[PDB]
Design a protein around this nucleic acid. Structure first.
Lengths: 89, 83, 81
RNA sequence: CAGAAAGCCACGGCUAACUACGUGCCAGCAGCCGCGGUAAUACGUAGGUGGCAAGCGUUGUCCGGAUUUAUUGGGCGUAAAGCGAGCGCAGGCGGUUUCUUAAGUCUGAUGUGAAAGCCCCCGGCUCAACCGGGGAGGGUCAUUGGAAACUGGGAGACUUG
RNA sequence: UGAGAGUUUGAUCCUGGCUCAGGACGAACGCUGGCGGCGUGCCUAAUACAUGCAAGUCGAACGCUUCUUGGAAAGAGGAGUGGCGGACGGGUGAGUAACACGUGGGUAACCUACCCAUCAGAGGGGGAUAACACUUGGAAACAGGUGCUAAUACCGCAUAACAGUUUAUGCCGCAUGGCAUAAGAGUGAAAGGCGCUUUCGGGUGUCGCUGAUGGAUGGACCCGCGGUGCAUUAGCUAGUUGGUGAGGUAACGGCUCACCAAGGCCACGAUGCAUAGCCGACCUGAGAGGGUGAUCGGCCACACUGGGACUGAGACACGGCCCAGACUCCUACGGGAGGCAGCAGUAGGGAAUCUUCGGCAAUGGACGAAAGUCUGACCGAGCAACGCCGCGUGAGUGAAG
């Protein structure tokens, strides 16, 4: 039940967010296995700061990227590349 | 299979037990504050087939699995015999 | 206190009842078999395969997981047939 | 519209800061030395000055200064400190030398020592903290290969102890 | 990156104690108003808890019932069976001197639905029941009786051993032992759900179901080494130590039974007594080393006290149960009800420590063919000058005082 997800680093008013990749038994900002990506919550068009190297390696193992990961990596087409290089493979 | 056990070439001290002897390894290490080399040892309960090695014999030993109330050693090779 | 697991309590109660019945059925089947083997007379194969059926159907139709059934068939076939 | 936006403890030495008067063995100051007691920069007022600075005094606790537990880093004639003296089990340390060994020791390669931590390089928040990217640190670690001077194990030798 | 200063005497040199100048109050300012940036806030009673919130979801598994519109069916609603989750998430440091922790390791003595991979497959029935209607006992909690009904609920029969031994064969390892092929004895299913072509069709795509082998995720066992004071604490141990066999165990094993012996651990500190959760880490030091274990993160343990299991693969279970004990509320007095060390909030203790605001918009859980529903996690808001950023309270000129 491995699962890639997000992680907050806020202050009071202005947050900063990070993608994080883990197993779903764990808490969100708690433990994990390794690291994937981040993104700016402010200044749209914000800073799409992605690894885009471990998502397809990680879903080769088989996981479930969450709701935000699918949209903001379909902006980079990684989920499009997921069913483009895995349903075609 | 990629790993054996760390063999500890101790000497035989007690052999009064059936299928069971006592192998004593010895090593020497430092002091956590001062410098010179100490001397210390443990005792290893070893399982034999029929108590081959006599008192003072030299034998290397190898661990297998918990056989008894935590004895975890076997005989390998009677290296040199006392007389 | 309780919110919605009282249905879980009643489910576990029914499972107690029927699992108790099934496990007692299995145990009495096994002892009914084991009486005959030390006896040495007739009816040695019918109750044999009935004991093996009981163990296997309480393994799969019932549940232990697989291996108490497997250890019993090992200690059984290494004793009877 | 300069308008709303200034507060703290002492001044005998250690340790920048003086006067006038009163109580004048007493009212009371002491971090320690130490004041007083009619001429107090020490008791008390009042003004003068001083150092932090929208934060500044007191109280308690932890490390230093402490070489005042000294491995780094102290010594026992008189200062605190050699048992009243011998004999010896275990233990600590051992004369010279040839060959071997490689346990200690020195050296390479590999896996690991979570991330945020501290530091350094680079960057953004108006700088700043906060956040981001990259490696050094934490092994007295595990496997594997050498080195054979010194210590340690095996075989012989010598005469000074 | 290592600063010394006073104080023993009439004066001197030594040795020596006491005190001070630095920084590390997680929380007492008697002053005062700028803090609007970043963070923190019961350490004493692991003391007792009013008030509300903190776990539900599935109608494409399946029967029944209350409404907008006597035949009408979409949407809505009510209960139940049945399925998955309540073992995650959040709190506390009472216990623990031990493989509890840190680090290095072992699985030829280990187990797992929840995500993919591979192959085998994947029928016909029964018989009850809840719900449902009526009555009995009920103060109530909740019991009881009769009758009827569904399923992916429950329950027996057919088919494969590929698992598992045992045999032969070859190959190898550190003792057991392991690896490939061929063969001797028994074993399942939801046979189900949706949508299309629907001219008998009955073929279906998907979602499910079962068996055997794999990867990955999670849990467990053992082993070398390391971190505490007392020797005005020197002996301790009998399932103990080993062997035999059996039971039992995911798994080895005195884990447990029966027999044979008397073995085991200790001056390198056994056993005993006291204190303490351990770690990554820190506003101390020149450095060797001393002090603290809050944040925040990891591991372990605990749920008013002590036992015990059941369902579930996973618990001996924090808002699950059973019994014993203490304590509290009702009882129509026969009997019943309860455990905030979850979030705020309450009374006591104390030198001392805050709001009973919204939403899942952000993110993360839980179920599902879907919108969706819940979340005192979390996002954020309202207090305490509680500590650190970075700036403020005018500037240039202007006196014989």
């Amino acid at each position: 039940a491995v699962k890639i997800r997000l992680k907050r680093m806020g202050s009071k008013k202005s947050p900063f967010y990070r993608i994080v990749v883990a197993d779903s038994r764990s808490p969100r900002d708690g433990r994990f296995i390794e690291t994937v990506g981040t993104y700016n919550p402010l200044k749209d068009p914000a800073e799409v700061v992605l690894k885009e190297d471990l998502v397809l390696d990680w879903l080769s193992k088989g996981a479930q990227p969450s709701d935000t990961v699918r949209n903001i990596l379909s902006k980079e087409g990684v989920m499009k590349k997921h069913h483009e290089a895995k349903n075609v493979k | 299979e990629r790993n054996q056990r760390k063999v500890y070439q101790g000497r035989v001290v007690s052999d009064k037990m059936d299928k069971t002897i006592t192998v004593v390894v010895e090593t020497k290490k430092n002091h956590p504050i001062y410098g010179k080399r100490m001397k210390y040892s443990k005792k290893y309960k070893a399982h034999d087939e029929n108590n081959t090695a006599k008192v003072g014999d030299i034998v290397k030993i190898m661990e297998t699995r918990p056989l008894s109330a935590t004895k975890r050693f076997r005989l390998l090779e009677v290296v040199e015999e006392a007389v | 206190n309780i919110e919605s697991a009282i249905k879980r309590v009643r489910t576990s109660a029914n499972a107690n009842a029927k699992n108790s019945s099934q496990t007692n059925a299995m145990r009495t089947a096994i002892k009914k078999f084991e009486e005959a083997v030390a006896a040495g007379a007739d009816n040695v194969d019918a109750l044999y395969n009935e004991a093996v059926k009981a163990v296997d159907m309480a393994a799969t139709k019932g549940l232990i997981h697989k291996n108490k059934a497997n250890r019993d068939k090992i200690r059984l076939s290494k004793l009877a047939k």
